[PDB]
Ligand binder design. Structure first.
Ligand SMILES: O=C(O)c1ccc(/N=C/c2c(-c3c(Cl)cccc3C(F)(F)F)noc2-c2cc[nH]c2)cc1
Length: 242
Protein backbone atom coordinates (compact mmCIF):
# COMPACT_ATOMS: atom_id res chain seq x y z
CA UNK A 1 0.00 0.00 0.00
CA UNK A 2 1.72 3.15 -1.29
CA UNK A 3 -0.59 5.46 0.66
CA UNK A 4 0.49 3.84 3.94
CA UNK A 5 4.10 4.81 3.22
CA UNK A 6 3.00 8.28 2.08
CA UNK A 7 1.03 8.59 5.33
CA UNK A 8 4.14 7.57 7.27
CA UNK A 9 6.22 10.30 5.61
CA UNK A 10 3.53 12.84 6.47
CA UNK A 11 3.29 11.74 10.11
CA UNK A 12 7.07 11.64 10.67
CA UNK A 13 7.48 15.09 9.15
CA UNK A 14 4.59 16.40 11.26
CA UNK A 15 6.10 15.07 14.49
CA UNK A 16 9.40 16.66 13.50
CA UNK A 17 7.78 20.03 12.72
CA UNK A 18 5.99 19.99 16.08
CA UNK A 19 9.23 19.20 17.98
CA UNK A 20 12.05 20.91 16.03
CA UNK A 21 12.43 23.91 18.45
CA UNK A 22 13.34 26.67 15.95
CA UNK A 23 12.01 27.01 12.41
CA UNK A 24 14.59 26.73 9.64
CA UNK A 25 13.48 30.08 8.21
CA UNK A 26 14.27 31.71 11.57
CA UNK A 27 17.68 30.04 11.81
CA UNK A 28 18.55 31.10 8.27
CA UNK A 29 17.27 34.66 8.72
CA UNK A 30 19.44 35.07 11.83
CA UNK A 31 22.68 34.10 10.06
CA UNK A 32 23.76 37.76 9.84
CA UNK A 33 23.16 38.13 13.60
CA UNK A 34 26.61 37.26 14.97
CA UNK A 35 28.07 37.75 18.45
CA UNK A 36 30.43 40.72 18.68
CA UNK A 37 33.98 40.38 19.96
CA UNK A 38 32.77 42.01 23.18
CA UNK A 39 30.01 39.41 23.47
CA UNK A 40 32.39 36.53 22.74
CA UNK A 41 34.75 37.75 25.48
CA UNK A 42 31.79 37.87 27.86
CA UNK A 43 31.08 34.19 27.23
CA UNK A 44 34.76 33.24 27.50
CA UNK A 45 35.03 34.94 30.90
CA UNK A 46 32.07 33.00 32.32
CA UNK A 47 32.86 30.19 34.72
CA UNK A 48 33.21 26.71 33.24
CA UNK A 49 30.40 25.74 35.60
CA UNK A 50 28.02 28.46 34.43
CA UNK A 51 28.62 27.51 30.79
CA UNK A 52 28.06 23.90 31.83
CA UNK A 53 24.78 24.83 33.54
CA UNK A 54 23.62 26.71 30.43
CA UNK A 55 24.62 24.01 27.96
CA UNK A 56 23.22 21.22 30.15
CA UNK A 57 19.86 23.04 30.28
CA UNK A 58 19.82 23.44 26.49
CA UNK A 59 20.74 19.80 25.96
CA UNK A 60 18.12 18.54 28.42
CA UNK A 61 15.47 20.53 26.58
CA UNK A 62 16.73 19.23 23.25
CA UNK A 63 16.53 15.62 24.49
CA UNK A 64 12.98 16.21 25.70
CA UNK A 65 11.92 17.44 22.24
CA UNK A 66 13.48 14.29 20.74
CA UNK A 67 11.48 12.16 23.19
CA UNK A 68 8.32 13.96 22.10
CA UNK A 69 9.37 13.35 18.48
CA UNK A 70 9.70 9.62 19.15
CA UNK A 71 6.41 9.43 21.07
CA UNK A 72 4.64 10.62 17.91
CA UNK A 73 6.40 8.15 15.58
CA UNK A 74 3.90 5.59 14.32
CA UNK A 75 4.11 2.42 16.36
CA UNK A 76 6.63 3.75 18.89
CA UNK A 77 4.10 3.92 21.72
CA UNK A 78 3.02 0.38 20.81
CA UNK A 79 6.48 -0.94 21.70
CA UNK A 80 6.96 -2.26 25.22
CA UNK A 81 8.36 0.31 27.62
CA UNK A 82 11.64 -1.58 27.93
CA UNK A 83 12.24 -1.24 24.19
CA UNK A 84 11.13 2.41 24.11
CA UNK A 85 13.72 3.17 26.78
CA UNK A 86 16.41 1.10 25.07
CA UNK A 87 15.90 3.01 21.82
CA UNK A 88 15.75 6.45 23.48
CA UNK A 89 18.76 5.80 25.70
CA UNK A 90 20.84 4.71 22.70
CA UNK A 91 19.60 7.24 20.17
CA UNK A 92 18.06 10.41 21.62
CA UNK A 93 21.36 12.25 22.00
CA UNK A 94 22.49 11.02 18.57
CA UNK A 95 19.37 12.76 17.19
CA UNK A 96 20.18 15.95 19.11
CA UNK A 97 23.64 15.98 17.52
CA UNK A 98 22.17 15.53 14.02
CA UNK A 99 19.55 18.24 14.62
CA UNK A 100 22.35 20.71 15.43
CA UNK A 101 23.42 20.92 11.79
CA UNK A 102 20.35 23.04 11.06
CA UNK A 103 21.74 25.74 13.34
CA UNK A 104 25.25 25.56 11.87
CA UNK A 105 26.48 28.05 9.24
CA UNK A 106 29.27 26.47 7.20
CA UNK A 107 30.34 29.77 5.60
CA UNK A 108 31.76 31.25 8.82
CA UNK A 109 31.72 28.04 10.94
CA UNK A 110 29.25 29.38 13.51
CA UNK A 111 26.30 27.90 15.40
CA UNK A 112 23.12 29.58 16.60
CA UNK A 113 23.48 29.73 20.39
CA UNK A 114 21.38 31.78 22.82
CA UNK A 115 20.07 34.11 20.15
CA UNK A 116 23.07 34.80 17.89
CA UNK A 117 25.67 32.91 15.85
CA UNK A 118 29.12 32.28 17.30
CA UNK A 119 32.19 30.18 16.58
CA UNK A 120 33.52 27.41 18.77
CA UNK A 121 35.65 29.95 20.67
CA UNK A 122 32.38 30.97 22.38
CA UNK A 123 32.71 27.76 24.41
CA UNK A 124 36.33 28.24 25.55
CA UNK A 125 35.45 28.28 29.26
CA UNK A 126 34.17 24.66 29.11
CA UNK A 127 37.73 23.39 28.55
CA UNK A 128 36.37 20.80 26.04
CA UNK A 129 37.99 22.09 22.87
CA UNK A 130 38.44 18.65 21.26
CA UNK A 131 34.81 17.67 21.83
CA UNK A 132 33.54 21.04 20.65
CA UNK A 133 35.69 20.82 17.52
CA UNK A 134 34.35 17.33 16.83
CA UNK A 135 30.76 18.53 17.16
CA UNK A 136 31.42 21.49 14.85
CA UNK A 137 33.16 19.21 12.33
CA UNK A 138 30.22 16.78 12.37
CA UNK A 139 27.69 19.58 11.85
CA UNK A 140 29.86 20.87 9.00
CA UNK A 141 29.72 17.53 7.19
CA UNK A 142 25.93 17.35 7.45
CA UNK A 143 25.41 21.02 6.57
CA UNK A 144 27.36 20.53 3.33
CA UNK A 145 24.63 18.09 2.22
CA UNK A 146 22.05 20.90 2.56
CA UNK A 147 19.93 18.39 4.47
CA UNK A 148 16.28 19.33 3.95
CA UNK A 149 13.77 19.40 6.80
CA UNK A 150 12.09 16.21 5.61
CA UNK A 151 15.45 14.49 5.16
CA UNK A 152 16.37 15.39 8.77
CA UNK A 153 12.99 14.14 9.98
CA UNK A 154 13.18 10.77 8.21
CA UNK A 155 16.91 10.26 8.90
CA UNK A 156 16.55 11.01 12.61
CA UNK A 157 13.53 8.70 12.83
CA UNK A 158 15.89 5.95 11.62
CA UNK A 159 18.61 6.97 14.08
CA UNK A 160 16.07 6.15 16.81
CA UNK A 161 14.27 3.15 15.31
CA UNK A 162 17.21 0.73 15.06
CA UNK A 163 16.48 -2.95 15.69
CA UNK A 164 20.16 -3.69 16.32
CA UNK A 165 20.26 -1.88 19.68
CA UNK A 166 21.37 -4.41 22.32
CA UNK A 167 18.73 -5.27 24.88
CA UNK A 168 15.49 -5.17 22.89
CA UNK A 169 12.83 -7.61 24.04
CA UNK A 170 10.62 -7.45 20.92
CA UNK A 171 13.16 -7.18 18.13
CA UNK A 172 10.73 -8.24 15.38
CA UNK A 173 8.39 -5.37 16.30
CA UNK A 174 11.20 -2.81 16.08
CA UNK A 175 12.29 -4.35 12.77
CA UNK A 176 8.82 -3.84 11.31
CA UNK A 177 8.88 -0.16 12.24
CA UNK A 178 12.43 0.24 10.94
CA UNK A 179 11.65 -1.36 7.55
CA UNK A 180 8.67 0.94 7.02
CA UNK A 181 10.71 4.04 7.97
CA UNK A 182 13.55 2.90 5.69
CA UNK A 183 11.09 2.53 2.83
CA UNK A 184 9.59 5.95 3.64
CA UNK A 185 13.04 7.57 3.59
CA UNK A 186 14.18 5.89 0.38
CA UNK A 187 10.87 6.53 -1.40
CA UNK A 188 11.10 10.20 -0.43
CA UNK A 189 14.70 10.53 -1.66
CA UNK A 190 13.71 9.01 -5.00
CA UNK A 191 10.69 11.36 -5.35
CA UNK A 192 12.84 14.43 -4.66
CA UNK A 193 15.82 13.25 -6.74
CA UNK A 194 18.03 13.27 -3.63
CA UNK A 195 19.31 9.69 -3.53
CA UNK A 196 22.81 11.09 -4.10
CA UNK A 197 22.98 12.01 -0.39
CA UNK A 198 22.90 8.33 0.66
CA UNK A 199 26.58 7.86 -0.20
CA UNK A 200 27.45 11.12 1.60
CA UNK A 201 25.71 10.44 4.92
CA UNK A 202 27.91 9.90 8.01
CA UNK A 203 29.61 6.50 7.86
CA UNK A 204 28.82 3.66 10.23
CA UNK A 205 30.12 4.36 13.72
CA UNK A 206 30.88 8.07 13.34
CA UNK A 207 27.71 9.35 15.00
CA UNK A 208 27.98 6.57 17.60
CA UNK A 209 31.55 7.50 18.55
CA UNK A 210 30.84 11.22 18.66
CA UNK A 211 27.78 10.72 20.83
CA UNK A 212 29.67 8.37 23.14
CA UNK A 213 32.42 10.99 23.69
CA UNK A 214 29.79 13.70 24.14
CA UNK A 215 27.66 11.88 26.71
CA UNK A 216 30.81 10.77 28.54
CA UNK A 217 31.81 14.42 28.97
CA UNK A 218 28.29 15.36 30.08
CA UNK A 219 28.41 12.57 32.67
CA UNK A 220 31.76 13.86 33.99
CA UNK A 221 30.35 17.38 34.36
CA UNK A 222 27.16 16.06 36.01
CA UNK A 223 29.25 14.10 38.52
CA UNK A 224 31.41 17.15 39.34
CA UNK A 225 28.60 19.73 39.30
CA UNK A 226 25.11 18.20 39.21
CA UNK A 227 22.38 20.21 37.49
CA UNK A 228 18.70 20.29 38.38
CA UNK A 229 16.71 18.60 35.59
CA UNK A 230 13.10 19.50 34.72
CA UNK A 231 12.42 15.79 34.53
CA UNK A 232 9.44 14.76 32.41
CA UNK A 233 10.24 11.12 31.59
CA UNK A 234 11.00 9.17 34.79
CA UNK A 235 11.95 5.86 33.09
CA UNK A 236 14.48 7.62 30.87
CA UNK A 237 15.74 9.97 33.58
CA UNK A 238 16.41 6.95 35.78
CA UNK A 239 18.63 5.36 33.11
CA UNK A 240 20.83 8.46 32.64
CA UNK A 241 21.04 10.10 36.09
CA UNK A 242 22.32 8.59 39.34
O1 LIG B 1 12.88 14.82 31.14
C1 LIG B 1 13.50 13.77 31.40
O2 LIG B 1 13.05 12.84 32.08
C2 LIG B 1 14.90 13.66 30.84
C3 LIG B 1 15.65 12.48 30.92
C4 LIG B 1 16.93 12.44 30.39
C5 LIG B 1 17.46 13.59 29.77
N1 LIG B 1 18.72 13.64 29.20
C6 LIG B 1 19.77 12.72 29.51
C7 LIG B 1 21.05 12.80 28.73
C8 LIG B 1 22.22 13.55 28.97
C9 LIG B 1 22.51 14.67 29.88
C10 LIG B 1 22.07 15.95 29.57
CL1 LIG B 1 21.12 16.22 28.15
C11 LIG B 1 22.35 17.04 30.37
C12 LIG B 1 23.10 16.86 31.51
C13 LIG B 1 23.57 15.60 31.84
C14 LIG B 1 23.29 14.49 31.04
C15 LIG B 1 23.83 13.16 31.44
F1 LIG B 1 24.84 12.77 30.67
F2 LIG B 1 24.27 13.16 32.68
F3 LIG B 1 22.91 12.19 31.39
N2 LIG B 1 23.14 13.19 28.11
O3 LIG B 1 22.61 12.17 27.30
C16 LIG B 1 21.34 11.94 27.70
C17 LIG B 1 20.57 10.94 26.98
C18 LIG B 1 19.15 10.79 26.97
C19 LIG B 1 18.86 9.76 26.13
N3 LIG B 1 20.02 9.28 25.61
C20 LIG B 1 21.07 10.00 26.11
C21 LIG B 1 16.70 14.75 29.70
C22 LIG B 1 15.43 14.77 30.23
Amino acid sequence: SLTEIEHLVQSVCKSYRETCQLRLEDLLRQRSNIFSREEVTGYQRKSMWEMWERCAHHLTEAIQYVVEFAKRLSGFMELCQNDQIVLLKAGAMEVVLVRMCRAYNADNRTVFFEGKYGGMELFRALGCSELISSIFDFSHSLSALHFSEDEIALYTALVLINAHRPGLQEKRKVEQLQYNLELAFHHHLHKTHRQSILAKLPPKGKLRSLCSQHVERLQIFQHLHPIVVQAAFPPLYKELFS
